[PDB]
Design a protein around this nucleic acid. Structure first.
Ligand SMILES: [K+]
Ligand SMILES: [K+]
Ligand SMILES: [K+]
Ligand SMILES: [K+]
Ligand SMILES: [K+]
Ligand SMILES: [K+]
Ligand SMILES: [K+]
Ligand SMILES: [K+]
Ligand SMILES: [Mg+2]
Ligand SMILES: [Mg+2]
Ligand SMILES: [Mg+2]
Ligand SMILES: [Mg+2]
Ligand SMILES: [Mg+2]
Ligand SMILES: [Mg+2]
Ligand SMILES: [Mg+2]
Ligand SMILES: [Mg+2]
Ligand SMILES: [Mg+2]
Ligand SMILES: [Mg+2]
Ligand SMILES: [Mg+2]
Ligand SMILES: [Mg+2]
Ligand SMILES: [Mg+2]
Ligand SMILES: [Mg+2]
Ligand SMILES: [Mg+2]
Ligand SMILES: [Mg+2]
Ligand SMILES: [Mg+2]
Ligand SMILES: [Mg+2]
Ligand SMILES: [Mg+2]
Ligand SMILES: [Mg+2]
Ligand SMILES: [Mg+2]
Ligand SMILES: [Mg+2]
Ligand SMILES: [Mg+2]
Ligand SMILES: [Mg+2]
Ligand SMILES: [Mg+2]
Ligand SMILES: [Mg+2]
Ligand SMILES: [Mg+2]
Ligand SMILES: [Mg+2]
Ligand SMILES: [Mg+2]
Ligand SMILES: [Mg+2]
Ligand SMILES: [Mg+2]
Ligand SMILES: [Mg+2]
Ligand SMILES: [Mg+2]
Ligand SMILES: [Mg+2]
Ligand SMILES: [Mg+2]
Ligand SMILES: [Mg+2]
Ligand SMILES: [Mg+2]
Ligand SMILES: [Mg+2]
Ligand SMILES: [Mg+2]
Ligand SMILES: [Mg+2]
Ligand SMILES: [Mg+2]
Ligand SMILES: [Mg+2]
Ligand SMILES: [Mg+2]
Ligand SMILES: [Mg+2]
Ligand SMILES: [Mg+2]
Ligand SMILES: [Mg+2]
Ligand SMILES: [Mg+2]
Ligand SMILES: [Mg+2]
Ligand SMILES: [Mg+2]
Ligand SMILES: [Mg+2]
Ligand SMILES: [Mg+2]
Ligand SMILES: [Mg+2]
Ligand SMILES: [Mg+2]
Ligand SMILES: [Zn+2]
Lengths: 58, 102, 252
RNA sequence: CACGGACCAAGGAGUCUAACGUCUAUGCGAGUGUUUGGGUGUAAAACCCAUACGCGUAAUGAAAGUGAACGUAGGUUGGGG
RNA sequence: GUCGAAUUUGGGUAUAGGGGCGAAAGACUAAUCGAACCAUCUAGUAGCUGGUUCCUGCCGAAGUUUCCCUCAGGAUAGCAGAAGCUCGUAUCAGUUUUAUGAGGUAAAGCGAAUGAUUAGAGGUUCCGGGGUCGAAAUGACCUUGACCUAUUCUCAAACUUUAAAUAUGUAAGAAGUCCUUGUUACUUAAUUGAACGUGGACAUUUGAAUGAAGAGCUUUUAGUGGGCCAUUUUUGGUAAGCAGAACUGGCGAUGCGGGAUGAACCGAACGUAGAGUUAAGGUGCCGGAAUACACGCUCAUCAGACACCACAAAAGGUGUUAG
RNA sequence: GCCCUGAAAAUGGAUGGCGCUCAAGCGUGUUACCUAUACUCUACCGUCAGGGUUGAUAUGAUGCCCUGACGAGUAGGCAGG
RNA sequence: GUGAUUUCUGCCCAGUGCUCUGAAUGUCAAAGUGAAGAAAUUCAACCAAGCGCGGGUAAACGGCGGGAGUAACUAUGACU
RNA sequence: GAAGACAUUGUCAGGUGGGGAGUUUGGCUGGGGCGGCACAUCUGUUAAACGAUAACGCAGAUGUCCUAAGGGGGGCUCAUGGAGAACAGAAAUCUCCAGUAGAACAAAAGGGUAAAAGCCCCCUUGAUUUUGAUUUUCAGUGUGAAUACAAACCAUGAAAGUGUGGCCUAUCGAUCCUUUAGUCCCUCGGAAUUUGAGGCUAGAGGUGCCAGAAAAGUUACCACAGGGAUAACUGGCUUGUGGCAGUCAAGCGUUCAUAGCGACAUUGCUUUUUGAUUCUUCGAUGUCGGCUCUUCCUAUCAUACCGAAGCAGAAUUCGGUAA
RNA sequence: GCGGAUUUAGCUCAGUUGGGAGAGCGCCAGACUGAAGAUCUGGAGGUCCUGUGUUCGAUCCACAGAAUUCGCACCA
RNA sequence: CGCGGGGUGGAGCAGCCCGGUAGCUCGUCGGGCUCAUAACCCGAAGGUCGUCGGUUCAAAUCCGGCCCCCGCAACCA
RNA sequence: AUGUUU
């Protein structure tokens, strides 16, 4: 016995019952796919900046 | 397909770690050995009564096997394995294509 | 998936022989000193019908050499044997119809019946009506007698084995058509429950290998291997050949 | 014009157990669980208890093995109070 | 039918279940036979059928995604409840506006490419040439074409220069803008740049509109995983109360007023009452409400009388009315 | 445009029926009127939310009181009885 | 298996069966044998029946063709 | 008497063994079966200009092929047409001109490409190593495919650069087991060495029903749980087909369209054909035909009364009221 | 209607890898015979079933058909 | 996967079983005999030994891969 | 050894 194959009927209503939520943007986003050379140098730059700011708090 | 030998390619032999000459051969599986734990277990399970105790594959669909090249560095003897796409005819010998011939 | 009739026959429940009216086992005398060394004379008192047997039986009375009494023996009557006839049995008995002789003591070409396969077995071969064994020669060293059996087979028997001179009485019996299911019924009523026979092809598959199908047919070769198992040996078991026999028999 | 049901009374169907997830309540808290057992008893109750054991306080690796502070146990941003 | 022998029959006896027995029907084997009966395993398993017991209150679905030896089932995500937690100067939005993108459908086009397609015209005789001569050559013509040129009629879901409407991405600030200069092993010819920073300045509109029973977050679980209908877009089919898709609204799960009647239509969604006003629909009587008002049309010997909806066409008529 | 011909199916029957002919038919326009669990106001019940009130005789602070809004429901969840 | 009597029972052993052959004959288990190894073990040779090889058998199971040209009207083909 | 270390008997091993035992003998599907693969996939369209989107929709394609048809660099420009040269014409080789690609790029289709991605030549192995991130399918799992980096070693070019297979969109495969390569690393748990075995990392031997059981039939002797989720009857929708009826009017009818007919077309009606569908019925609507009997319809064969004729009479034909 | 096959000089047929349309039986002509038949030589014979496209061309690489046939067409 | 056997003129076989070397029959063609045909007689043409590589003072032969055919035996992704 | 018709 054949049946229905596909429909998007009621799917938008289901999605909008709990709403379509924007993905909660954060400051300082993740560096997941950032160029690893840039990331490697960024780690040393931030380390040097932290050490400079610590030494300069007199 | 037609694959040449001597394969100037990367070697990881911890002495070369660089592009060296590699002799190319076709990988062969090798005889299934008794005393391998799976074979021992299978023989123990097949002993006695009960008949065939594990599946025997029948629904073959592939018409080709994936060619594997055993690549042996000519200086350090380290072997690497390279898998080619499926092919029905594989030759290691030469007789390269000649252009403009009749 | 059912036990077939030829498998059921081996249990011997309804397939045993109907032996009530039988006169007793037909045997030669026990091979004793008198027959081994000389001869013993008995007297044919009765020639009687045996139920289930074509050949008539002869009741022969001998004297017991060791005790004062008579010993009645049931021989298979040979043609020409009559009541009041003296039967002589032993190594030294004469070559006369009805006499029991060792096979070695008879000349080549002698016709014997109720022939022992082994000395002292009291008769195994050529016992049916009209059947007989032909002496074709002797091997005096390692004493053996070559005989031709009713089937035509050549057999080598010990020269001490005994036989009755002549042919078994009642010959020509199978020449008369039975003409009637009733006559076959009365024939087998006093032998065994082997009649009538339902064709296996007229049965269902559960009952017989030949059963089933939308037409009555065997379906596979009726020639069955000698190495087949019980329930499979229906049809022509271990047939060397099939079809109408043409030409001469006695392959060699 | 699908199925069960003529009627009535009584009976009649998510239970208990072992091991568990979340949540909640309670006791104690880097500890926790007396009740296998022992002592005791007004005797299957109640009361008391040693050594263990379980779980937690350390993870990771197949394993051999190794094993958690540069810092006011870090910096930046938001953060109730 | 048969009735004197393969006859009928009593009693005794033998053959016992995958066994017996069968002149063979899968027949008979104690009303049980294509595997007897009895007890136990056993409360066997069942994605399948039936049932599943008090009240009220609040919230409240799905027939959809993916996977499965899956298609009457399950897992998974989604829809839903409950428990809440962190805050609440507040956060965001099935919406608009402004600014800036993307699309190749509707339309349109074919004297624009591709593919079709109608006709005539002019050049190609060196047009492919034929007829006919030419004593013969295309040489003179008649001319069938096959091209080229400029036109011409009509087309495309798998054609297109162009190209909407609707729908759709992003942005409209303090996580911003501007100024100075610290880190780096990155990068640059180079303190050059990149990123992250220290310090300093800018709150009435902190940089469109409207709204905001607030926002954000977490856990865990039920049922569901046969759908169907209506407008619109649309595929197959002659078509279907057919079969399959898109968006939305509904029915399922929903009573109420209307459509006489009806799951889906119209109107409107529901605690218990009173009063008033209405919706859709109606106001001759059934039947609550004007046999109201006004302009016309129609006479039917099958008149006609409210969408969904319960049918009617081509062609005709000095019927009648108006152009 | 209206009407008529085209226009044939089987139980007797359907603008819903009766019936209706300057209609109670058709097209159009204007008012008046009728009535839903819809809208407005009020009362009561419950739910939710925001609050006030341990200053006592106040024994019901999960109590008393004020304010606003809301109430459809299968499968199903929870709560109070 | 067929199924009184009468009259017959034609061709096919390629296929599937059945059967007869057997150290000339390929494959072939365990045991046994040899070699290597320190041994587990590995390899090799040998290797029964069976199968294969060769024969028989259809009153065994069974089977038992197609095309087109051709005869003093057409037609059909004895014929090829 | 025979027979004799052979039979026999016991164990293991090979053969045979539907006689018997156990089990299996896909899914989708306008019922099922047969057919097909819409089962894992790719191109264009359906698809309604974001994305997504179904049917056993449409036109097709995939399980390959390639050491170059991969990579780099250089030089050149293709299809076609025109004009020219002995054999040589209409196709050979040579020359020029025009030539936006009308060619070619392995294959299906779509896109892309002109000092190239095409053709030729030169050199090569980036079709290499390590482990991550990301896009599509999506649960934001797997697999396949692909993208951009990093850390190496290379190739090519003068160099900038480019290359982690095929210009892009398809060309494929889990657990367990086996096997190979690497690390020469861990373990064999009373302590060692050597074999052997087990581990770690990366491949291969495959499941095409392609998220991946190991699987032949028959039942007309049949059984069970169910299913109107689903066929065989009526009924309902539709009317392709069947049947019946119109409109036009080229012609037939000697002349003459319409007495009677009537082509090429076209509009309908009916549910007495057969289809299409699967809405009702599978805890059951008794499934052909005939017999009997009642009633209904009219698309009327006869009878009543008529109109028309290619109606002189007779007979007949067409039509009306008429069941 | 589905799953298949084949289509070539008058007949039977072989082509076929992007060869090249060919062989027997026919027919014709010449041999031989007194003359036939039988033979033995040589030749012609298709625009490859039709129409349209892709290749440098094409039975042969290559699309829509046409003809001839074989198997299936079942459960009520 | 394993063990074996076979491939030779157009067709069927020998030569292979250790290198001295391509042969037998049928078939084709030419001639001869016969009045003619067959048989017969004399000639000629026809493979270089399934494909490559290997070892040989000079291999079809001996060896190793590979293509096709057959028999037996074997089968955990 | 065979060689068909008139
Ligand atoms: K076992
Ligand atoms: K049978
Ligand atoms: K045979
Ligand atoms: K045979
Ligand atoms: K068996
Ligand atoms: K079965
Ligand atoms: K019709
Ligand atoms: K039914
Ligand atoms: Mg579904
Ligand atoms: Mg064991
Ligand atoms: Mg065993
Ligand atoms: Mg008999
Ligand atoms: Mg019989
Ligand atoms: Mg029967
Ligand atoms: Mg049987
Ligand atoms: Mg059998
Ligand atoms: Mg029968
Ligand atoms: Mg009904
Ligand atoms: Mg039911
Ligand atoms: Mg009932
Ligand atoms: Mg009760
Ligand atoms: Mg039967
Ligand atoms: Mg139960
Ligand atoms: Mg609600
Ligand atoms: Mg599976
Ligand atoms: Mg159900
Ligand atoms: Mg499009
Ligand atoms: Mg358009
Ligand atoms: Mg369901
Ligand atoms: Mg349906
Ligand atoms: Mg429901
Ligand atoms: Mg409603
Ligand atoms: Mg109505
Ligand atoms: Mg009134
Ligand atoms: Mg009209
Ligand atoms: Mg009318
Ligand atoms: Mg009214
Ligand atoms: Mg009016
Ligand atoms: Mg009210
Ligand atoms: Mg409160
Ligand atoms: Mg409620
Ligand atoms: Mg007969
Ligand atoms: Mg016969
Ligand atoms: Mg052995
Ligand atoms: Mg043997
Ligand atoms: Mg069985
Ligand atoms: Mg199915
Ligand atoms: Mg789109
Ligand atoms: Mg270039
Ligand atoms: Mg894929
Ligand atoms: Mg690179
Ligand atoms: Mg794999
Ligand atoms: Mg392993
Ligand atoms: Mg140990
Ligand atoms: Mg799958
Ligand atoms: Mg139904
Ligand atoms: Mg019709
Ligand atoms: Mg009934
Ligand atoms: Mg009835
Ligand atoms: Mg009428
Ligand atoms: Mg004559
Ligand atoms: Zn190396």
């Amino acid at each position: 016995a054949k049946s229905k194959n596909h429909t998007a009927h009621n799917q938008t209503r289901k999605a909008h019952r709990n709403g379509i939520k924007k993905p909660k943007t954060y400051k300082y986003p993740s560096l997941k796919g950032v160029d690893p050379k840039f990331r490697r140098n960024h780690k040393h730059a931030l380390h040097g900046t932290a050490k400079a700011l610590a030494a300069a708090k007199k | 397909v037609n694959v040449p030998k001597t394969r100037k390619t990367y070697c990881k032999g911890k002495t070369c770690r660089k592009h060296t000459q590699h002799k190319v051969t076709q990988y062969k599986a090798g005889k299934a050995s008794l005393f391998a734990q799976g074979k021992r277990r299978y023989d123990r399970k097949q002993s006695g009564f009960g008949g065939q105790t594990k599946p025997v594959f029948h629904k073959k669909a592939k018409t080709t096997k994936k060619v594997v090249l055993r690549l042996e560095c000519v200086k350090c003897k380290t072997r690497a394995q390279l898998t080619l796409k499926r092919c029905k005819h594989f030759e290691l010998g030469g007789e390269k294509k000649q252009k403009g011939q009749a | 998936g059912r036990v077939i009739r030829n498998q059921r026959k081996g249990a011997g429940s309804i397939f045993t022989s109907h032996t009530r009216l039988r006169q007793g086992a037909a045997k030669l005398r026990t091979l004793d000193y008198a027959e081994r060394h000389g001869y013993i004379r008995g007297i044919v008192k009765q020639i009687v019908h045996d139920s289930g047997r074509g050949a008539p039986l002869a009741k022969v009375v001998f004297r017991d050499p060791y005790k004062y009494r008579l010993r009645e023996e049931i021989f298979i009557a040979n043609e020409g044997v009559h009541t009041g006839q003296f039967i002589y049995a032993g190594k030294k008995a004469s070559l006369n119809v009805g006499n029991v002789l060792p096979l070695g003591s008879v000349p080549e070409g002698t016709i014997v019946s109720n022939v022992e396969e082994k000395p002292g077995d009291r008769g195994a071969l050529a016992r049916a009506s009209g059947n007989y064994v032909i002496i074709i020669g002797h091997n005096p060293d390692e004493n053996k007698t070559r005989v031709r059996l009713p089937s035509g087979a050549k057999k080598v028997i010990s020269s001490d084995a005994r036989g009755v001179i002549g042919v078994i009485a009642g010959g020509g019996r199978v020449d008369k058509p039975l003409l009637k299911a009733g006559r076959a019924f009365h024939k087998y009523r006093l032998k065994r429950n082997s009649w009538p026979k339902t064709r296996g092809v007229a049965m269902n598959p559960v009952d017989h290998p030949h059963g089933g199908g939308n037409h009555q047919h065997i379906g596979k070769a009726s020639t069955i291997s000698r190495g087949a198992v019980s329930g499979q040996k229906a049809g022509l078991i271990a047939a060397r050949r099939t079809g109408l026999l043409r030409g001469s028999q006695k392959t060699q």
